[PDB]
Paper text:
Hemoglobin has been recently rediscovered as a drug and oxygen carrier for biomedical applications due to its unique pharmacokinetics properties. Hb has recently moved to the center stage of biomedicine as a potential carrier of drugs; it can be readily obtained either directly from patients or as a highly purified biopharmaceutical protein, it is biocompatible, non-antigenic, it undergoes naturally controlled degradation processes, it is amenable to genetic or chemical modifications and it shows unique pharmacokinetic properties. We employed chemically modified Hb with maleimide-deferoxamine as a chelating agent for 89Zr. In this manuscript we demonstrate the feasibility of the method proving the Hb-DFO conjugation by X-ray crystallography and matrix-assisted laser desorption/ionization-time of flight mass spectrometry (MALDI-TOF MS), the quantitative 89Zr uptake by Hb-DFO using radiochromatographic methods and finally analyzing the biodistribution of the Hb-DFO-89Zr complex over time in naïve and lung tumor-bearing mice.
Two DFO molecules per Hb tetramer were identified as covalently bound to the β chain of the Hb tetramer by MALDI-TOF MS analysis. Subsequent X-ray diffraction studies demonstrated unambiguously that a single Hb-DFO adduct is formed, namely the maleimide-DFO reacted with cysteine residue at position β93, located in the α1β2 interface.Human Hb-DFO crystals diffracted at 1.55 Å resolution and were shown to belong to the P212121 space group with the unit cell containing the whole tetramer. The electron density clearly shows a ferric form of Hb with water bound to the heme iron, except for one of the α subunits that has the heme group in double conformation, one of them being in the oxygenated form (50% occupancy). The root-mean-square deviation (RMSD) calculated using the Superpose program were 0.44 for the R-state and 0.80 for the T-state, confirming that Hb-DFO is in the R-state and indicating that the presence of the DFO does not affect the overall quaternary R-like structure typical of ferric Hb. The map around the side chain of Cys93 of both β subunits clearly displays additional electron density corresponding to the maleimide moiety and the first six atoms of the DFO as a double conformer. Indeed, the chelating long chain is unstructured in the absence of a divalent metal, and crystallographic data do not show specific interactions that would lock it in a fixed conformation. The largest displacement with respect to native aquomet-Hb is observed for Cys93 and Asp94: Upon reaction with the maleimide-DFO these two residues adopt a different orientation, with the terminal part of their side chain pointing outward. This is the only conformation of Cys93 compatible with the steric hindrance of the maleimide ring, which consequently displaces Asp94 out of the way of the long chelating chain of DFO.
Numbering used by the authors:
A (entry chain B), D (entry chain D): 1 to 146
B (entry chain A), C (entry chain C): 1 to 141
The structure:
C-alpha cells in the first residue's frame, strides 16, 4: 500500500505513542467481545466468560502483543506486506482455518482502539491513513486464500 | 431485536452523546468520505469539504434517525420503515456502505466517549448499528 | 420481511425440490466443503467424503429446517428460534459461512431445476436464504 | 490465484462449451435483478424495472458480452490476473467507483449461471475450481482500490 508523505508521518507519530504491551491485547480482547464467533478460535486461551474476563485474560494479553508486533512489522514494510505476512497467511489459512473477513474486522477494532485511546488526535485524516494500513495488512494476511 | 443488555448499553451510551449526536453524525460522514472515497458518489452535488454546512445538515438527519431508533429499539423496523424504501429503491445504497458508515460512527463515538466506550458498550453499539443497517436494507431481503 | 412476490416463488421452487430436499441439502454442504474448505472445521466428527452417509443425514436436517421455514415464511424468527441459539452460542458459526452455504444452495438448485431457476426465482431464493441466515445469526444481532 | 493443474483443466474444458453471446448477458442481468443496488451503475441502459425487462435489455446483453470477454482473458492468463485486469481495475475504481464487494457478487452470479447452463456437469469439484477463478478475477479488479 502507498501512504502520502503527510500520511506516513501521521501514522508513525501516533504509533510511537502506542503502548506495545497493551494495545494489541485491547484490540484482540474487543474482537472477542464484539464479534463473539471469533472466540471459537481462542477457546484454549482459557476464561472468556465475561467481557472483563476476556480483557484481563493473560493469554489474550500475551497473544495481543504478537498481533501488534505483526502490525508494527507491516508498518515498517508497507512496500512489501505480502512477504511481511507470507507464512502467517499460510498459518491462518491452512492450520487455523480463519475466514479472512475477520482480518478486516480485527483491523477495524484496532482503529476503534486507537480512536478510544487517542481521542481528538485520531483525526479523520489520521484515521484514513490507518484504514489504508489495516486494509493492507488484512489483504497480505489473506494472500494464501486469494 | 437487541437483547435487554444491548438495549440498556445503547441507551446509556446515547444518553452521554446527548446534544452532540448531530455533531458526531457529521464527523462520522466526514470520516467515511475520507477513509472510503467510493461513498462520495452517493452525494454527487453535495459540498463535501471539511466542516461543510451541508454535511452538518445531513449529519443532523442521520443522528436524529439514530436517536429515534434508540427510543424505539423494540420496534425499529416500524420507526425507520420510511428510510428503508428510500435507501433501497431511490438511492440504491450498496449494503457495504452501511458497514462503512457504522464503523465510522463507532470510531467517532470512541474518539468522544473515553469512559463510556467499554468493550461491552462497543459490542452493543455495533449490534445496534447493524440492526439499523438491516432495517434500512430490508427492501433487498 | 420478504415481499408477497418473494413468498410465492420460494414455495413453488421448494415444492418441485420435493423428496430431493435432503439430497440437495447434502450436495450444497459438499459444494461448500469443497469450494470453501475453512467450513470443514465445523464438522470434525464427520466423514466428509463424496456420498458420505453422515453428510446425507445432515443435509436432511438442513433441508427439513428450510422446508419448515418455507411453511412458516411469515414467522421465520419463531420457526428457527432454537437454531439461532445453537449456531451462535454453542457452535459459534462465523456469519460469513451462512453466505457461503446459501450460495451453494442456489448453485445446487440451478444445477437440478433449470426450468424453475429463473432470474425472478433466483432473487426470491437469495432473499429467502439471507432472511434464514439473519435469523440464524440473530444472537449476533 | 492457485488452481491446481487439474482445476485449470476442468475450468478450461467447461469454458470451451460456454456460449460467448449469452452467458455474460445472463450473469449481468441476474446481478441487476438479484442485487438491485447494482442498477445504480447502469442507469443509462434503459428499463431495468422487471426481470423480463432486464433479461431482454439489449445494452445489458451487449455489455455482458464484454464482461464475459474479460473473464475469458482472465482464464487465458491465470498466473497474471493482476496485470491482465490492471486497466479495468483503474476504470472501475477511478471512473465508476464500484465497491469491490460487487466483483465477488458478479463472480458468484456467474457461478450460478454456469450451474444453470451445465446441470450435473457443473459438479462440486468444477464449482470449487470456478470459485478460485472468480475470487482471483475479483481480487485482481480490486488491486487499484488498495
Ligand atoms: C488481521 C490481523 C492478524 C494478525 C496480524 C495476526 C497475527 C497472528 C500471529 C502473529 C500469530 C502467531 C502467534 C504465535 O505463534 O506466537 C497468530 C496466531 C493466531 N491467530 Fe492471528 N492474526 C490476525 C488475525 C486473526 C484473526 C481475525 C483470527 C481469528 C478470528 C486469528 C486467529 C489466530 C489464532 C487462533 C492463532 C493461534 C493462537 C494460538 O493458539 O497460539 N488471527 N495470529
Ligand atoms: C446509520 C445509517 C444511516 C442513517 C441513519 C441514514 C439516515 C438518513 C436520513 C435521515 C436521510 C434523510 C431523509 C430525508 O431527506 O428526508 C438520509 C438521506 C440520505 N442517505 Fe442515508 N442514512 C444512513 C446510511 C447511509 C449511507 C451508508 C449512505 C451512502 C453511503 C446514505 C446515503 C444517503 C443519501 C445520499 C441521502 C440523500 C441526501 C440527499 O441527496 O439529499 N445513507 N439518510
Ligand atoms: C441455511 C443455513 C442453515 C440451516 C438451516 C442449518 C440447520 C441446522 C440444523 C437443523 C441443525 C441440527 C440441529 C439439531 O439437530 O438439533 C444444524 C446443525 C449444525 N449446523 Fe447448521 N444450519 C445452517 C447453516 C450452517 C452453517 C453455515 C454452518 C457451518 C459452516 C453450520 C454448522 C452446523 C453444525 C456444526 C451443526 C452441528 C452438527 C453436528 O455436530 O451434528 N450450519 N444446522
Ligand atoms: C467482476 C467482474 C467484472 C468484470 C470482468 C468487468 C468488466 C468490465 C469491462 C470489460 C468493462 C468495459 C466495457 C466496454 O468495453 O465497453 C466494464 C465496464 C463497466 N463495468 Fe464492469 N466488470 C466487472 C464488475 C462490475 C460490477 C460489479 C459493476 C457494477 C456493479 C460494474 C460496472 C461497470 C460499468 C458501469 C461499466 C461501464 C459501462 C458503460 O456504461 O459502458 N462492473 N466492466
Ligand atoms: C484507482 C481508484 C482509486 O480509488 N485509487 C486510489 C487507490 C488508493 O487508495 N491508494 C492509496 C486508484 O488509484
Ligand atoms: C488455502 C489456505 C492455504 O494455506 N492455501 C495456500 C497453500 C495450501 O496449503 N493450499 C493447499 C490455500 O490455498
Amino acid at each position: 500500500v502507498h501512504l502520502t508523505p503527510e500520511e506516513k508521518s501521521a501514522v508513525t507519530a501516533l504509533w510511537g505513542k502506542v503502548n506495545v504491551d497493551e494495545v494489541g491485547g485491547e484490540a484482540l480482547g474487543r474482537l472477542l467481545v464484539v464479534y463473539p464467533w471469533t472466540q471459537r478460535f481462542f477457546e484454549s486461551f482459557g476464561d472468556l466468560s465475561t467481557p472483563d474476563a476476556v480483557m484481563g485474560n493473560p493469554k489474550v494479553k500475551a497473544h495481543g502483543k504478537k498481533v501488534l508486533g505483526a502490525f508494527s512489522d507491516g508498518l515498517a514494510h508497507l512496500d512489501n506486506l505480502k512477504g511481511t505476512f507470507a507464512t502467517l497467511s499460510e498459518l491462518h489459512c491452512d492450520k487455523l482455518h480463519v475466514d479472512p473477513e475477520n482480518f478486516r474486522l480485527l483491523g477495524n477494532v484496532l482503529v476503534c482502539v486507537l480512536a478510544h485511546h487517542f481521542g481528538k488526535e485520531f483525526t479523520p485524516p489520521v484515521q484514513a491513513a490507518y484504514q489504508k494500513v489495516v486494509a493492507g495488512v488484512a489483504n497480505a494476511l489473506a494472500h494464501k486464500y486469494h | 431485536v437487541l437483547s435487554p443488555a444491548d438495549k440498556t448499553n445503547v441507551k446509556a451510551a446515547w444518553g452521554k452523546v446527548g446534544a452532540h449526536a448531530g455533531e458526531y453524525g457529521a464527523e462520522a460522514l466526514e470520516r467515511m468520505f475520507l477513509s472510503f472515497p467510493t461513498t462520495k458518489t452517493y452525494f454527487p452535488h453535495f459540498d463535501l469539504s471539511h466542516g461543510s454546512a451541508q454535511v452538518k445538515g445531513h449529519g443532523k438527519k442521520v443522528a436524529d434517525a439514530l436517536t429515534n431508533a434508540v427510543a424505539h429499539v423494540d420496534d425499529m423496523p416500524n420507526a425507520l420503515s420510511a428510510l428503508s424504501d428510500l435507501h433501497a429503491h431511490k438511492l440504491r445504497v450498496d449494503p457495504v456502505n452501511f458497514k462503512l458508515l457504522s464503523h465510522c460512527l463507532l470510531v467517532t463515538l470512541a474518539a468522544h466517549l473515553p469512559a463510556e466506550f467499554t468493550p461491552a458498550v462497543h459490542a452493543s453499539l455495533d449490534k445496534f448499528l447493524a440492526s439499523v443497517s438491516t432495517v434500512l436494507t430490508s427492501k433487498y431481503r
